[PDB]
Amino acid sequence: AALWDNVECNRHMLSRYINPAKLTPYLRQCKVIDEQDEDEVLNAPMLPSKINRAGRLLDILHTKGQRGYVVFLESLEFYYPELYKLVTGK
Incomplete structure (x- = not known):
């Protein structure tokens, strides 16, 4: 939750x-x-706006407990380094 x-x-x-x-x-x-x-x-669907393209994924991950959170974070560390730093504040 936090x-x-x-x-x-x-x-x-x-x-x-x-x-x-x-x-x-x-x-x-x-x-x-x-x-x-x-x-x-x-x-x-692939929409003209990309603003919510990963919205569904996040909402699914939100239901996957602390395992989901931690694994998602590592996926950002691997594939989206700036986004990882954004999330972890580093």
């Missing part, structure tokens, strides 16, 4: 700048989302 605050207060940058497809293979491999979660994220 741990997730780090993601939620940065949800705007995360929702725009994450390309979900880059993250899902690692998230799935770590078992924090499944094939169907990935489907929902990958099959979502």
Whole structure:
């Protein structure tokens, strides 16, 4: 609830700048989302606005407990270093 605050207060940058497809293979491999979660994220319409493109992914991760939080953070550390620093305040 408070741990997730780090993601939620940065949800705007995360929702725009994450390309979900880059993250899902690692998230799935770590078992924090499944094939169907990935489907929902990958099959979502490609809109003119990218502002909410990773919105669905975040909302799914929000339901995945501290494991989800920690694995998501490492996925940012791997793939989106500036976003990782944003979330962790470093």
